Every structure is written in C-alpha cells, then in structure tokens.
Write an enzyme that holds these catalytic residues in place. Structure first.
Site, PDB file in Angstrom:
ATOM      1  N   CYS A   1       0.846  -1.181   0.000  1.00 11.55           N
ATOM      2  CA  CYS A   1       0.000   0.000   0.000  1.00 11.55           C
ATOM      3  C   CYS A   1       0.890   1.242   0.000  1.00 11.55           C
ATOM      4  CB  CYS A   1      -0.908  -0.011   1.236  1.00 11.55           C
ATOM      5  SG  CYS A   1      -0.063   0.072   2.850  1.00 11.55           S
TER       6      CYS A   1
ATOM      7  N   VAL B   1       9.532   4.152   5.745  1.00 16.56           N
ATOM      8  CA  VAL B   1       8.960   3.829   7.050  1.00 16.56           C
ATOM      9  C   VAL B   1       8.797   2.324   7.222  1.00 16.56           C
ATOM     10  CG1 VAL B   1       7.707   6.018   7.039  1.00 16.56           C
ATOM     11  CG2 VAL B   1       6.541   3.894   6.360  1.00 16.56           C
TER      12      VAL B   1
ATOM     13  N   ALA C   1       2.936   1.268   7.465  1.00 21.78           N
ATOM     14  CA  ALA C   1       2.104   2.360   6.973  1.00 21.78           C
ATOM     15  C   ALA C   1       1.642   3.370   8.017  1.00 21.78           C
ATOM     16  CB  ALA C   1       0.899   1.796   6.241  1.00 21.78           C
TER      17      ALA C   1
ATOM     18  N   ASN D   1      -3.131  -2.288  -1.683  1.00 20.71           N
ATOM     19  CA  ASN D   1      -3.175  -3.573  -0.991  1.00 20.71           C
ATOM     20  C   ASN D   1      -4.473  -3.849  -0.248  1.00 20.71           C
ATOM     21  OD1 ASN D   1      -0.657  -5.426   0.975  1.00 20.71           O
ATOM     22  ND2 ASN D   1      -2.213  -6.061  -0.530  1.00 20.71           N
TER      23      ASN D   1
ATOM     24  N   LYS E   1      32.390  17.707  10.084  1.00 22.55           N
ATOM     25  CA  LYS E   1      31.597  18.387  11.098  1.00 22.55           C
ATOM     26  C   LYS E   1      31.252  19.853  10.835  1.00 22.55           C
ATOM     27  CE  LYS E   1      32.803  15.152  14.760  1.00 22.55           C
ATOM     28  NZ  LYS E   1      33.672  14.196  14.011  1.00 22.55           N
TER      29      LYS E   1
ATOM     30  N   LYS F   1      35.168  20.118  18.824  1.00 20.63           N
ATOM     31  CA  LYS F   1      35.437  19.014  17.908  1.00 20.63           C
ATOM     32  C   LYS F   1      36.053  19.480  16.588  1.00 20.63           C
ATOM     33  CE  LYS F   1      31.042  17.296  18.195  1.00 20.63           C
ATOM     34  NZ  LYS F   1      30.021  16.262  17.877  1.00 20.63           N
TER      35      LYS F   1
ATOM     36  N   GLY G   1      37.066  10.150  18.262  1.00 21.66           N
ATOM     37  CA  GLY G   1      37.127  11.008  19.425  1.00 21.66           C
ATOM     38  C   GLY G   1      38.494  11.593  19.705  1.00 21.66           C
TER      39      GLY G   1
HETATM   40  C1  LIG Z   1      36.666   4.004   9.042  1.00 25.63           C
HETATM   41  C2  LIG Z   1      37.656   4.226  10.210  1.00 25.63           C
HETATM   42  N1  LIG Z   1      39.042   4.431   9.892  1.00 25.63           N
HETATM   43  C3  LIG Z   1      39.547   5.271   8.914  1.00 25.63           C
HETATM   44  O1  LIG Z   1      38.815   5.969   8.199  1.00 25.63           O
HETATM   45  C4  LIG Z   1      41.018   5.276   8.728  1.00 25.63           C
HETATM   46  C5  LIG Z   1      41.362   6.187   7.574  1.00 25.63           C
HETATM   47  C6  LIG Z   1      42.854   6.192   7.339  1.00 25.63           C
HETATM   48  N2  LIG Z   1      43.356   4.830   7.112  1.00 25.63           N
HETATM   49  C7  LIG Z   1      43.119   7.072   6.123  1.00 25.63           C
HETATM   50  O2  LIG Z   1      43.900   6.737   5.046  1.00 25.63           O
HETATM   51  O3  LIG Z   1      42.477   8.354   6.240  1.00 25.63           O
HETATM   52  C8  LIG Z   1      37.132   5.286  11.183  1.00 25.63           C
HETATM   53  O4  LIG Z   1      38.017   5.805  11.876  1.00 25.63           O
HETATM   54  N3  LIG Z   1      35.788   5.553  11.285  1.00 25.63           N
HETATM   55  C9  LIG Z   1      35.242   6.464  12.218  1.00 25.63           C
HETATM   56  P1  LIG Z   1      33.963   5.636  12.842  1.00 25.63           P
HETATM   57  O5  LIG Z   1      33.026   5.442  11.914  1.00 25.63           O
HETATM   58  C10 LIG Z   1      34.369   4.082  13.176  1.00 25.63           C
HETATM   59  C11 LIG Z   1      35.439   4.011  14.262  1.00 25.63           C
HETATM   60  C12 LIG Z   1      35.860   2.566  14.516  1.00 25.63           C
HETATM   61  C13 LIG Z   1      35.645   2.096  15.951  1.00 25.63           C
HETATM   62  N4  LIG Z   1      36.169   0.722  15.989  1.00 25.63           N
HETATM   63  C14 LIG Z   1      36.064   0.164  17.330  1.00 25.63           C
HETATM   64  C15 LIG Z   1      36.696  -1.239  17.341  1.00 25.63           C
HETATM   65  C16 LIG Z   1      36.648  -1.799  18.770  1.00 25.63           C
HETATM   66  C17 LIG Z   1      37.317  -3.178  18.794  1.00 25.63           C
HETATM   67  N5  LIG Z   1      37.294  -3.720  20.157  1.00 25.63           N
HETATM   68  O6  LIG Z   1      33.329   6.212  14.156  1.00 25.63           O
HETATM   69  P2  LIG Z   1      33.853   7.479  14.905  1.00 25.63           P
HETATM   70  O7  LIG Z   1      35.270   7.311  15.372  1.00 25.63           O
HETATM   71  O8  LIG Z   1      32.951   7.711  16.090  1.00 25.63           O
HETATM   72  O9  LIG Z   1      33.894   8.557  14.098  1.00 25.63           O
HETATM   73  N1  LIG Z   2      28.221  17.626  22.231  1.00 27.73           N
HETATM   74  C1  LIG Z   2      28.640  16.575  22.836  1.00 27.73           C
HETATM   75  N2  LIG Z   2      28.254  16.320  24.148  1.00 27.73           N
HETATM   76  C2  LIG Z   2      28.675  15.200  24.863  1.00 27.73           C
HETATM   77  N3  LIG Z   2      29.484  14.265  24.363  1.00 27.73           N
HETATM   78  C3  LIG Z   2      29.876  14.488  23.086  1.00 27.73           C
HETATM   79  C4  LIG Z   2      29.519  15.575  22.281  1.00 27.73           C
HETATM   80  N4  LIG Z   2      30.091  15.485  21.064  1.00 27.73           N
HETATM   81  C5  LIG Z   2      30.797  14.355  21.127  1.00 27.73           C
HETATM   82  N5  LIG Z   2      30.696  13.721  22.327  1.00 27.73           N
HETATM   83  C6  LIG Z   2      31.370  12.441  22.735  1.00 27.73           C
HETATM   84  O1  LIG Z   2      32.539  12.319  21.949  1.00 27.73           O
HETATM   85  C7  LIG Z   2      32.557  11.118  21.129  1.00 27.73           C
HETATM   86  C8  LIG Z   2      33.211  11.482  19.817  1.00 27.73           C
HETATM   87  O2  LIG Z   2      32.611  12.649  19.184  1.00 27.73           O
HETATM   88  P1  LIG Z   2      31.999  12.538  17.724  1.00 27.73           P
HETATM   89  O3  LIG Z   2      31.228  13.828  17.594  1.00 27.73           O
HETATM   90  O4  LIG Z   2      31.254  11.280  17.454  1.00 27.73           O
HETATM   91  O5  LIG Z   2      33.249  12.611  16.783  1.00 27.73           O
HETATM   92  P2  LIG Z   2      34.234  11.470  16.263  1.00 27.73           P
HETATM   93  O6  LIG Z   2      34.084  11.461  14.782  1.00 27.73           O
HETATM   94  O7  LIG Z   2      35.570  11.897  16.739  1.00 27.73           O
HETATM   95  O8  LIG Z   2      33.778  10.111  16.876  1.00 27.73           O
HETATM   96  C9  LIG Z   2      31.088  10.701  21.060  1.00 27.73           C
HETATM   97  O9  LIG Z   2      31.048   9.478  20.844  1.00 27.73           O
HETATM   98  C10 LIG Z   2      30.557  11.194  22.418  1.00 27.73           C
HETATM   99  O10 LIG Z   2      30.780  10.240  23.465  1.00 27.73           O
HETATM  100 MG   LIG Z   3      33.746  10.432  12.837  1.00 27.88          MG
END
Ligand SMILES: C[C@@H](NC(=O)CC[C@@H](N)C(=O)O)C(=O)NC[P@@](=O)(CCCCNCCCCN)OP(=O)(O)O
Ligand SMILES: Nc1ncnc2c1ncn2[C@@H]1O[C@H](COP(=O)(O)OP(=O)(O)O)[C@@H](O)[C@H]1O
Ligand SMILES: [Mg+2]
Ligand SMILES: C[C@@H](NC(=O)CC[C@@H](N)C(=O)O)C(=O)NC[P@@](=O)(CCCCNCCCCN)OP(=O)(O)O
Ligand SMILES: Nc1ncnc2c1ncn2[C@@H]1O[C@H](COP(=O)(O)OP(=O)(O)O)[C@@H](O)[C@H]1O
Ligand SMILES: [Mg+2]
Ligand SMILES: [Mg+2]
Ligand SMILES: [Mg+2]
Lengths: 589, 589
Positions: free
Chosen positions: A38, A57, A60, A128, A469, A504, A511
């Site tokens: 639908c 979604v 519906a 539907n 960002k 940030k 982070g």
């Molecule tokens: C895709 C990831 N890495 C890169 O892009 C590396 C790029 C680098 N090799 C380059 O040539 O720029 C990345 O950093 N993504 C950011 P993300 O998507 C996923 C973070 C991964 C967390 N892994 C946890 C593993 C735990 C194992 N116990 O998320 P954020 O960091 O929050 O941004």
């Molecule tokens: N405005 C905010 N207030 C509180 N915690 C934040 C805020 N922005 C980011 N954080 C904390 O910082 C972590 C990383 O920031 P994020 O904005 O996701 O950037 P990154 O790409 O570095 O992961 C988040 O996972 C969260 O725990």
């Molecule tokens: Mg990121």
C-alpha cells in the site's frame, strides 16, 4: 488476479497492481517500495503527480507521524501537516489517508490517496486491499462514507474494526493540525541485563574455521567486550524512534550537502583545497545515489534523542553489530528479543546489487588490524551481491593505466581509506589535481588512485561533505531547534556558554582532540590526537548516559540512505574512542 | 587512430587522431569529435573545472567566445580573452588559441596551458602530436615565452602560425579584449537570379520519391513564386548564425532553468498548475532529449536579433533540407551551397543518440503540411534504426493500456501536435491531470496520450517553456542588452514606447495576432488569429529587412541543441505567417 496483474489506474494514470503473494520498485534512480504494498502505490502516486515522496517507514501507520515530504527534483524539504479524523480541515483530493494498526490492518496499518471528495463521501485509491480488476475507467478503489457536522469532517471506513488516524496535507498553514508526536522518554531508557552464566563463552565460541570470524579473532581474539554475560536492552518503541531519526536526518544531511555545494561561502568553511571543488559538485550530481553505508552517533536516554555526527565518508562497526553480535546471540541468548543489526550483511549485499559498481571491485584498505576484518566483511557483502574482489592492503601492490599485482586493471574501488588522507597528499604539494599517471620507480600514491577520472569509487567524493563536522552549524542553520539536533557553531556564542559545549575538529574521528566543557565552564574531559591543528566546531554539551558502569552510546547504520541497524559503543569515559567496545544489544517488546 | 599517447594534468587522456561512433561523450554531455583538438580542450575543462565552451566550427572560433557553461547547474560564466603579448599572464588551465593559417590552415588550433615558467610554458593538446609520450610527462609541447617590460609573448614551435592569445575564466576584464562584432555589410542579404533554361517547367521535383510526392500533393511543384530567384549570404554571416544559435540556445536553457525554480516566474506562462510538478520532472530527466527547434532572426547591416524560438513544435525542415536540395540540384551550377543540406542526416543523428524506444508512433493533426512534415521525420527515424507508424488523428487509438489500430502498444511517440493544445484540454475542464485510462466507446483524447506516464514523448514537456514567449522578458532580465536580444516586457514600459514595439501572444504561432506599433505610435501592421485572449509580451520593434520586393527573415535549426541549418521566409508584409514561402538560400564564400 495474480501478483503483478494490473487492476487499474488512479488519477493521473497511476497504475495499481494486485499483490496476492525483483521486489523493489523503482522509477529511475528513485526507490518507491516493495511490490505491491500500500506504501509503494502511495509513494509512487505522489512522485508521479507531485514529484515529492515521503521517507522510508517500517509500517504504513507510521506515515501519520511524518511532518515533512521530500521534493525530488532538488532534494528539498516540504512541510506536511497531519489531521485527525473529524477535523475542521476537509480531506482534499491528493491528501494521504492513514489507517492506524488494528482490525483489518493488523500491525501494518494502511495508507491511501483521497482521489475525489464529494458531499456525503469520498473516493480513495490504494494498492493492498483489492486484488481484482477494477471497473473499466474507474480510478478509485473504494468509497468511504463521510459525515459533516458543524464544519467537521469524519470518515467511516468500510471495515467495522479499523481506526482511521486522519489525512495529511502539504501546506504551511498549521491551523487545525496535530503537533508532531514525541515518544515518552521512559521508552528511550537503556537497560542493563545479564544472561545466566553457564560458560557459553568459556572458550572458542566464535567459529575460527569461518574466514571472516577468524579474521576478526586474529585482531581481537575471542572477545567483544569486558564481560560477554552482560547485554543491554531497548524497547521496540525506541528502535522505531531510531529508525525514524535515521531516515529523517539522512535527508536533512543530503539537503544540507546540496546547499553547501551551491554556495561558495559555505563550501569554504570545510577547509578543502579549491582545486577539488569542481570535482565535489560533479560527484554530487553524478554519484548522488551511490553512497552505500554510513553510521550515526546518538545520545539516547529519557531526555530524548540527539545526534553527534554522521560518519558518511568511512565507517566501521559493521562486523561487530552485524556478525559477532549475531554469533554472540546464537551462543548465549535464549530470550524473545532480537539483535537490531542481524540484517546488516544482506542489507549491504542489497545496496551493492543495485549500485552501479563495475563487475570487479578492488578493495583498498590501509594496514590496520581493524580495517583488516572490516575489508573482509565488506568483501563478503559484495560476493553475495555477486561481485569479484581483491583486497589491497596499502599501495605497494599497485602500479601503472592503473593495475594491481596480478596485472589486472583497477577501474572500481571500495576504500576504507578516508578521503581526508587523500586531501593531505594534495595539501602537502597547478591546473588540476596533481596526480601521477606515470613514475620512474612505479610508485603509486593514494590520490593517484581515488582521483584518477576512470576509477569508480565508493564512498563517492561528495560524501566528504556530510562527513565533515563543519556541516553541523549548517544543519542547525537550516533546521533551527530541530528535535534531533544540538546547537552547533564555529565559535562559542552566549547560548553555548550557558549550556556548555564539546569542541570538535571538523575532520577528526575516533574522538580525537575532543573537549567537553560544562555550564560551570569546567572541562569535563579532554583527548589528544593528530587533528589538533584543524578548525573546530562548538556543539551544545549533551553527555552520554551512564548504565552499569559504562557510558553507552547509540549508533545506527545507514544503508543506501536508510536504517540498516543499531548498535552500542560503551566506554568508562564520556568520550567514545576507536577502542571503545561494542556491547551486545537486544531489542524487546 | 585512437591510440592512448598520454595524460594531461589531472589524469586527462590524450588520443591520436590519425586516419586511414566518432562522437565523444562523458555521460550525456557531448565532448567533441574524436579525436580533434577541440574535443580534448573541452574534455579537459569538463573533467577538471566542470565547465565547457559552446560548439564551434573551428578551434580559432573559441577565441571569440565570452562565456563558459558550468555543467552541474547550466549556469553561465564570464570568459575573457587576452591577445598574445599581454600584461595579463597566460596562467595554467587557460585556453590558448591559434588563429587559422600556416600549419593550422582553415581550423586554427586549441591547447591547454599546463604550466607557466620564467621563459617557457608547457601546453597539453590533441591532434598535433600523434606519437606516444614519455612516461609520466603530462605536457605535449613547450613554447618559448618572452617576458618584456611586463608583457607576455609566446612563440609557436611552427614558423607559419599565429597565436591569438589565451582565455581566462574571470570577471576582471582589465587588459582584456572587447567582444568581436561582425562587420555590418558582411551581413547583407542579396538577391540573385539564375539563367532561365526551363529547369523548373515540368515535374522538377522527383515524383518518384514518396517524401517529395507528398510535398507536391500539398503544394504542387512549388517552393516560391519564382524559382529562378534566390538570396545569398556570405560565409561570414553563416559564421555569425552558427555562433548566435548555439549561444542563444544555452541562454534559453539557462532561462528555462531559472523559471522552473521560481513559481513567481513559472506563474507567468499561464500553464495549468497541475502540470508544474510534471514540467520540473521532465526538465530533470529529459534535459538532453530535445531533438529539434527553429529560431527566427532579423538579419541585415543593422545586426542580428532574435524574435522567437520554436522549441515545442516547429517545421520547415522539408522545405529547407529536402526540396531546396532538389532545387539546387536542378538549377544551381554555382560555387555556393544550401546552408541546410545536412539537416536530414543531422536529425537521424540526434535520434541515434536519443533514449527513444525501438518502435515510434508518429502523431500528427490532420493538416496537409504536417502530412509531409511527419513523413520527413519518419524518414529521419528510419535512417536511425527505429520502426514507426504514422497516426493521423486519434481514431486508430484504443485501450487497459494505450494501443494502436493494429493492436501494438503505444509507449513512445513523436508528435507534430502542440503541447499547448493538450494544455487546452486541461483548461477545458482534480487530484491529478485528468486523463482517461478507459472509456465506453473507446475514445482517446490528445491529453490521453501525451500525459500518460509510460509514454515517451518528443519533444519532451519542458520545451513548452523556451517555446513560450513569456520567456522573452526573462532572457532580457538575465542578459540585459545582449547583442542578439530585444527589450521585451509584460507591459509597454518607457523605452519600448520610444523605440516602437511588437505585441504578441506568449503561446502563439504562424504570426497570429501580431501587432506592430512604431515609435511614432501607429499600427504599422496587424493580424488576426485564435490566440487573441492570451497574455502578450511587448518586444522592441526591429522590422524585417526588405530585399527584392520582399521581407526576408533568417531561420536556423537546432538539432540536439546545436546549429543544423539555415533557411529563409519571405513575405509581402512585415509579419511572416504560416503560408509565407521558403525562398531558396545559397551561402557564398
Ligand atoms: C573508518 C575508520 N578508519 C579510517 O577511516 C582510517 C582512515 C585512514 N586509514 C586514512 O587513510 O584516512 C574510522 O576511523 N571511522 C570512524 P567511525 O566510523 C568508526 C570508528 C571505529 C571504531 N572501531 C572500534 C573497534 C573496537 C574493537 N574492540 O566512528 P567514529 O570514530 O565515532 O567517528
Ligand atoms: N556535544 C557533545 N556532548 C557530549 N558528548 C559528546 C559531544 N560530542 C561528542 N561527544 C562524545 O565524543 C565522542 C566522539 O565525538 P563525535 O562527535 O562522534 O566525533 P568522532 O568522529 O571523533 O567520533 C562521542 O562518541 C561522544 O561520546
Ligand atoms: Mg567520525
Ligand atoms: C509545428 C507547427 N504547427 C503545430 O504545432 C500545430 C499543432 C496542432 N496540430 C495542434 O492541434 O496542437 C507550427 O505551427 N510551428 C510554428 P513554426 O515553427 C513553423 C510554422 C510552419 C511554417 N510553414 C510554412 C510552409 C510554407 C509552404 N509554402 O514557426 P512560426 O509560425 O514562425 O512560429
Ligand atoms: N520585435 C519585432 N519587431 C518587428 N517584427 C517582429 C517582431 N517580432 C516579430 N515580428 C514579425 O512577426 C512575425 C511573427 O513573430 P514570431 O515572434 O516569430 O511569432 P510566431 O510564433 O507567430 O511566428 C515574425 O516572423 C516577424 O516578421
Ligand atoms: Mg563518533
Ligand atoms: Mg515565427
Ligand atoms: Mg512560433
């Protein structure tokens, strides 16, 4: 009539088929729905006559909760009002008519188009309900008695056990309309849970004979988190809210992307080398529908739902939420709940099948042990979507026309590499992107592959805009005080000083270099990283909830623009990092 | 021929154009003819800056252009020119143009400056070097540059050639060259008589050819009132006509784009609002599907102006590209040629590159002129591979899908019908465009065919916009004082009052209801017609030149967007009409 049979047309000539059970339905590059729900009809009807469409979604009845439509020829957002059955506002032709769940329309609910309104009834068209050919030339499926008492219209469905929420009209005039719903924070609470220890995880619970798991094991060992006997639970209601926020925010992001790419003043705030701009725009117009997957960061607790960032460029967690958590569940969970990411692999193969990706895809990854299983997890999604791949760790196996080790041509690439890294190789060093197409000691760089004109790349170059960002202050700008957003600015203004804020870097991740300051002007937390020198954004402080000694964060995956799953990251600190673990998550009703 | 020699900066291929399917595209955007100098210079610009220059006859012509087209949003940019020897330096990325003469005879040449130095500049180009290039060398030739007293001068590596200068895309015009204006007299039209030898006394038109026979059946063995007379124009003017066609065309699309983005503008064409949503979709997906149009100009020592642009439904192709061929073939033993002799191959061309279905139903109203017009086109399609079937009237059409008298499904049609006439079928009498998908007596209307979603129609819907005169004031608005435009408005402002002005229905044709007020304020001429109730536009008076007891008007065809020929229309009055004749035209060098 059989599934697929044409039973008639609706106003404007819009077909209506029998769906008495190639199931996706597209009108060019645009997704319409499953056949022949639908919802597919309703969306196609609006697309073909008004060139507008409503978000994806689950069921519906959820359409009555939307408060915006997307104008398709320009990725623009339109306001959409909702009206209660019995409203002073008449159900004009063209409006969407929504049925809640209950009665004939059990859990799904129902949606239809009001084709013609009269004096004592109205005619609607739908897909539907009727599975038999319609009277030749009839462009309506049913008639619904409509009563009119004191300038109030009330519809009476033809079913004795159904409830009609109302109709929706796309107008700015809010008079008589329903305020946008808002889930009871109570339902957004993350709860701790424990399984009964019987040593289900005492040993090798992750299959090592499976190449993909073993790859994961070789990077983390037989481990997901601190204690595999402790998981977290959310209500199916909160999940619904996450599916709603994910799909909505994505369009807001693409919409903001659109505006940035059309205004140099905005594009200038991302600190991207000018030489690349013309290439960004082209990427936008041409690869607009090619983004395969992204992941959003959310703070979710009784206070509501907020979004921190959108990892559009490159994002991991896929293996965790979609594979290990699947085996974890199969190994220790015996409840009625479910893993909200168990359909991640199939959801990815699906996006690939429908992507314009060439036959053979070269998978490029940096030499990182996490990227190691990530690459293999994406490779299995492609093999399912029937593609061929070779993984390339680093650039060494590359050489020149770009070719790989085994002498094969490199014309299609999936990168775990971040576009920013390639932007550095340009920042460090003309009439064009300074890429080499030849070199004495056959030394290929990153920019030498991702920016070569004939190479098909995922994620596309435009994704680096919603992935930076500096897009956040723009989001705030286009949708001020939007329920899911946080005030973000390129400076610290008065309103951020009161609330407190997170500093940030516009192009960081994991982070790195993050500063949390409270309203008391006190630094709650700091991190270091290699991105110390980049421009910063200042976003309203909103700290993660603490549950069972860990600060939990909610992440949703976008697959081809729509919710593909949910997962958790949990850390002893307020800031999540590359190390922060993935906690098991089960959704319950 | 076709061999890969190397790559210019950014990774832009360079092929050999030796000799012993020749079109080059990058998506739906035309790059040029393989493997010329112009094709490279355009593809280099398209891939690195997302801009391109209009089509031109010879490379030396590019140096006359004063604008570039930004592809991601059909926007127009300023392109300044600087003569060899100039305080303005020849930066990288700039176009370098050779005049004609010496090594680059009639064509002249075009290259891209890849890198400037202290005493030399490197340039990349095609069709000058037909041998492979040194590994990684992204330039083709170096040129001595002599910087003296602040002026830059380049010397070619050839001893008989001339460098015109270089072209920078900027708004700063200091040190630049003014736009080239064509010398008045080279634009004078001139009568010429043949030697009467009874070349046109019998059936000089081959009645064996069905296409010619049909034309005879509608006019007899006739073109004009005296076939021993014709007009001539200098090759210098045709130059000017090819230049003004391709440019106005882009100006018209640019204007179209603007209108479709702002209701306030769109609201000015008086099209039923239920179609607005459809016009916009048409424009976004059928942007490159326009096959042909005709532009009307006033040409003489006074200059070149443009009256209108029949984009929707225009004819005169049989007359100019077939009968006049036969004409010349029968009484012209001169050096000149018919400026529209290729038209028929030009059209079969656009059709090969259209996304038209294999079977095409040609739709025409019962007119004796349309009868051969549609058989002329049916021939253009046959030469392009498609199958067809002419349909005169609407009677052979049935129904729940639209089929032809022989049963076949109609889903792709070429019409001679005007889009404005179906619009009337909407303004005659709803949640959508009111069309029948069935009817008792099986009665398909025109609207029941052109607006049925699954039917592919040429010309596409959006053409009703640049084909509407309401766009004239818009063009004047976007390009005020453009050398080819006339001050047009929706009222009779101050200026028109003193210059004299033509009054005309925004959706008319054939000269119906045209009014001509002079600066002395007196109705010079006036005509009747069916569009007297329509909104009007007021265009600056600029009367047709009168030659050899006749008022001549220049017409140019656009096929697939670019020049495709030229023809004449002559009349006893200042206003050309349906029956105005086609006067033979020969171009002379
Ligand atoms: C895709 C990831 N890495 C890169 O892009 C590396 C790029 C680098 N090799 C380059 O040539 O720029 C990345 O950093 N993504 C950011 P993300 O998507 C996923 C973070 C991964 C967390 N892994 C946890 C593993 C735990 C194992 N116990 O998320 P954020 O960091 O929050 O941004
Ligand atoms: N405005 C905010 N207030 C509180 N915690 C934040 C805020 N922005 C980011 N954080 C904390 O910082 C972590 C990383 O920031 P994020 O904005 O996701 O950037 P990154 O790409 O570095 O992961 C988040 O996972 C969260 O725990
Ligand atoms: Mg990121
Ligand atoms: C294509 C033409 N006609 C239509 O579109 C009629 C459509 C009609 N069937 C409908 O019902 O909509 C048309 O009027 N075009 C306007 P045009 O493109 C071409 C006019 C044709 C002149 N023919 C002269 C033949 C002389 C023979 N001795 O040009 P303008 O009238 O200037 O606008
Ligand atoms: N601004 C003008 N000044 C003088 N004559 C004009 C002007 N505009 C049109 N005409 C005359 O009127 C004829 C009809 O106008 P045109 O704009 O071509 O509309 P139509 O679609 O009816 O052919 C032209 O062919 C020309 O002879
Ligand atoms: Mg994060
Ligand atoms: Mg005309
Ligand atoms: Mg006309």
């Amino acid at each position: 009539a059989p599934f697929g049979t044409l039973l008639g047309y609706a106003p404007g000539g819009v077909a209506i088929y029998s769906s008495d059970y190639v199931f996706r339905s597209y009108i060019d590059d645009e997704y319409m729905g499953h056949k022949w729900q639908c919802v597919e009809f309703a969306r196609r009807f609006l697309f073909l006559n008004y060139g507008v469409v409503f978000t994806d979604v689950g069921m519906a009845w959820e359409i009555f909760s939307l408060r915006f439509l997307r104008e398709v020829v320009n990725d623009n957002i339109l306001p959409l009002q909702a009206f209660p059955n019995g409203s002073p506002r008449a159900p004009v032709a063209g409006a969407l008519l929504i049925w809640d769940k209950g009665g004939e329309f059990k859990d799904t609910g129902h949606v239809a188009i009001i084709t013609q309104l009269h004096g004592n009834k109205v005619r609607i068209a739908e897909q539907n309900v009727i599975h038999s050919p319609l009277p030749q030339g009839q462009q309506w499926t049913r008639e619904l008695e409509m009563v009119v008492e004191n300038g109030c219209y009330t519809l009476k469905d033809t079913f004795d056990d159904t409830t009609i929420l109302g109709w929706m009209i796309q107008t700015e005039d809010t008079e008589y309309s329903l305020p946008q719903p808002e889930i009871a924070g109570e339902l957004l609470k993350i709860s701790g849970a424990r399984l009964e220890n019987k040593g289900q995880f005492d040993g090798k619970w992750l299959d090592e004979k499976d190449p993909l798991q073993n790859a994961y094991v070789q990077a983390n060992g037989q481990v997901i988190n601190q204690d595999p006997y402790h998981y977290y639970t959310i209500t199916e209601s909160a999940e619904q809210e996450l599916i709603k926020a994910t799909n909505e925010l994505h369009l807001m992001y693409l919409h903001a992307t659109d505006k940035v790419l059309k205004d140099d003043n905005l594009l200038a705030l991302f600190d991207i080398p000018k030489i690349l701009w013309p290439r960004l725009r082209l990427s936008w117009q041409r690869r607009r529908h090619h983004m395969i997957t992204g992941r959003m960061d959310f703070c979710m607790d009784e206070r509501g739902l907020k979004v921190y960032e959108y990892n559009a460029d490159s994002a991991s967690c896929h293996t965790e939420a979609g594979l290990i958590l699947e085996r974890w569940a199969e190994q220790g969970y015996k409840g009625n709940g479910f893993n909200p990411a168990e359909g991640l692999i199939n959801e990815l193969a699906g996006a690939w099948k429908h992507s314009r990706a060439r036959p053979f895809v070269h998978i490029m990854q940096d030499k990182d042990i996490e990227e190691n299983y990530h690459a293999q997890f994406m490779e299995q999604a492609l093999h399912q979507a029937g593609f061929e791949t070779r993984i390339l760790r680093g650039l060494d196996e590359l050489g020149w026309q770009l070719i790989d080790g085994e002498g094969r041509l490199v014309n299609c690439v999936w990168k775990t590499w971040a576009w920013e890294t390639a932007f550095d190789q340009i920042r460090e060093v003309f009439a064009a992107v300074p890429i080499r197409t030849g070199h004495p000691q056959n030394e290929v760089r990153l920019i030498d592959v991702l920016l070569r004109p004939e190479v098909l790349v995922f994620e596309p170059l435009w994704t680096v805009i919603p992935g930076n960002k500096a897009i956040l202050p723009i989001l705030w700008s286009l949708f001020p005080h939007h329920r899911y957003l946080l005030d973000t600015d390129f400076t610290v203004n008065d309103e951020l000083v009161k609330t407190g804020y997170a500093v940030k870097p516009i192009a960081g991740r994991c982070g790195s270099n993050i500063d949390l300051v409270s309203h008391h002007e006190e630094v709650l937390d700091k991190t270091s990283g290699k991105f110390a020198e980049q421009k910063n954004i200042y976003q309203q402080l909103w700290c993660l909830p603490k549950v069972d000694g860990k600060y939990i964060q909610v992440c949703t995956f976008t697959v081809g623009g729509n919710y593909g799953g949910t997962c958790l990251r949990g850390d002893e600190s307020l800031v999540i990092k590359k190390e922060s673990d993935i906690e098991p998550l089960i959704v319950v009703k």
